[model samples]
Target chain A: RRFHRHEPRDHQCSSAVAKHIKAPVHLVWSLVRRFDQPQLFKPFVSRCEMKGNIEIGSVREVNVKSGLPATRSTERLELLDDNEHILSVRFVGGDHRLKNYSSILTVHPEVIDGRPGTLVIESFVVDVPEGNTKDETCYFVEALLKCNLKSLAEVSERLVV
Target chain B: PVWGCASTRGRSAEMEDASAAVPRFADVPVRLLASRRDLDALGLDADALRLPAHLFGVFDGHGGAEVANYCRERIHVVLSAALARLGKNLGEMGEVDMKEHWDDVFTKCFQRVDDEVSGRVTRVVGEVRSEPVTAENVGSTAVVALVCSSHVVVANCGDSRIVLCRGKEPVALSIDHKPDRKDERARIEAQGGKVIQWNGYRVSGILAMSRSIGDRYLKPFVIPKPEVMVVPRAKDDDCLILASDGLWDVVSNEEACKVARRQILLWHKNNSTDPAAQAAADYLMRLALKKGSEDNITVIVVDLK
Candidate 1:
């Protein structure tokens, strides 16, 4: 993650790219805001990734700082060889809106209902395609989402409301 | 005395290089005591001055070192010149014409001194920046102290400040002019300068107002003005401290004041009344240095018995 400093030259990271994921889903949600990927895969990821789902298992890009969209930011990726030689570098787009905060669900002050939500991370996987050598490495990551319907009685039981 | 010890960075031959990491005003000490008989000659009263006989000061030049060096080298000259200029302006140029309204006379005399310095600073800075001016991007922050028979006059500009300690209590004598301050920003804008909006703060993207002295490039929207305040000596106040922002930024006013008061009381209990000023200044500088201050740290303390 970054610090409380200026986002120089849109150096911020972005959400995941569309792909066929072969990894477990739970790891994806967990890896977003925080993850210490293997040193071999570290170069391919210049920064950490963060994403959240609006509904069950439907994920969208999120900013690390503001937890909103990050479309306008840059995400630089670096690739290294088996012997730890830096091999490649590429830029990933970002969305700033992902960083914005979500307002609470509106309900009458007298009848409060919180539709509690949950985002479960599953797995991360990577692979080298196309002109891949006998010994090539790749990474893939995934996560799961949940939306529990709010219950006025059960929710209120957790609070004085 | 508001004078401080030299900066821990010491005087390096490296300051000749403008961009050199070492600052020009390296030796920032409290008692760079080059006392002149001339300054004291102006207000000779048979009723001996009693409050603060020991006087000291520190000048922290930020943009450049010209003004700081000038003031330290000629502060005696400045003070003496102020009195002589005062006499001339007050129609008391001749001793026979000395007036009886003591307070009015001093007020007018002080105003004359301020006007002269202000006017001189404007002219000097203009000329210095215009001609072969390699020193165009420089300025100074001054912490001044005048120990009189009954009061400790403290003045500051930029973020430099002074703290007074009475046995175990600390007294504040100056305010910081951080760019985040509304009034400081207003002054800068009023003088026609752009303020950068960042993280809900209006900062001097272009200039500063409440500085003792600053560079010429910054002159159009800059000021070399100083804030003068008088701190009357109280029986409870035992020590007076003057320091640069390096120390103030690292610590709070209440905390620094507490440390100063406690330190002075320690000195007093040890049968040493004169140790407070130098001790407090040294303590502050060392504290800042230990905190890894990248900027120059200057401090001065005056013992009020």
Candidate 2:
């Protein structure tokens, strides 16, 4: 009958992995806006394809290459903001260990070390697969997120220099 | 005198009386006190569909208060109609029947209430919604006790429970419908729903309990069917308790009854004419908070002796 604002079960675990990209917001947003091609920056994702032209509620097929926990995921684009530099995608269905997956990637123009840069944040929530500890789930997910962020920074750095 | 309401808003140590459903058994001095905690909403209702036997219910609302409040307003009425359909005037029946048909009656009443909450569904008129009225977001747990002359009937859905303290032995009359329970989890998965353990085993990483009155979003997965039980009243039956998980989550059945029994004795020792049901209810509520229970605490102490 009672409700807690932050009840643990009700609380969704939002893992926000942020990187200060030494590139402009337009450059970072361009990479993020390509919802059809996430593999460009995500090292583990071997293949990314869109069924058709990008639009709201469009589903994107993502396949993780071998050598990492192999997975094929289908995600739906829930929201896209061009001016705000924000995009949201929900895992509609997937063969990955994670369930109920959703992620939001937002790029904000920022001044890091008094230099023009973009703060790119990718936050996600998903259910831990059975027979796995939360630490294991976090370990697996954070590894992927850290790799993605690192790739994003590296990719932007290559373009800038 | 009619029983007074004892509930709290569950924010701090303070409380507020929202609504209640308390009716004394005509033959005995059964003063029930249902103290509340932070559970967003508490409900109590009493109805005498039959002459001597009365139906009493306690509803705990979650997601939103409207669903539980709507149950409080509609369950008894639906129960009366269900009982009438059985062609048995429960008031006049000499020996209480513990048959499959009786279970059907309880099932139908709960289903009817769930349908009402899931349908017309217009309990909270002022509340606006951006989506359809599919009852996807709100629901409540229930513990209902039907006190008759010969037997006591208990029907439970969700995690709310009913316990009977029989002569120093506390016997639980209802099982909590939690997502972790083996059978409950099996049912959830059988329906193609996932029972994942986030903070606890929850259906679809959402509601913690497997069964509920509303929650159309998880329909065909989270059911409204209640586990019903009938136990004949005995001379050794000292008291009965119907409470929400707010209380059961912290206090064990045996401990609650033991403390309640001692509190009733204390009340008698003070030369008070009133039964100690209120004191017991309040004591449990305070004790739960003292034990660091963060959920809403509600306990109905019924004097069977």
Q: What is the C-alpha lDDT of each candidate?
A: 0.40, 0.68
- Residues A1-161 of candidate 2 have per-residue lDDT tens digits of 01101122432344567788898999988988899999777765767878879999999888764223335788899889999887888888766566777777888889977888998877777776666566545544665676678778878878998
Which number leads on TM-score? 2
Model 1 stretches astray by more than 4 angstroms = A1-161, B1-6, B10-55, B88-134, B198-210, B271-276
After superposition, the stretches of candidate 2 with alpha carbons farther than 4 Å from their true spots are A1-80, A83-102, A105-161, B1-5, B12-51, B88-97, B120-135, B272-275
DockQ of 2: 0.04
> How far in Å is the alpha carbon of A22 misplaced in model 1?
69
Give the TM-score of each candidate. Answer: 0.48, 0.60
Encode model 2's per-residue lDDT on B1-305: one tens digit a residue. Answer: 21212355554322211123545422311111111221113322222223345656667776446667767777776776666545433324433344565678779878877876666333334573333233245677877887766778788887788789999699998888888999988887787767666446667654678887877656777889999887888899877777776678789999988988888778868861134778887888788777887656677777777
lDDT of 1 by residue, B113-220 (tens): 333333432324424422322233345555556565555555555567778776666667767655556776677668865444322222233223344443444444
True C-alpha contacts between chains kept, each model in order: 0.00, 0.00
Report the number of the highest-lDDT candidate. 2
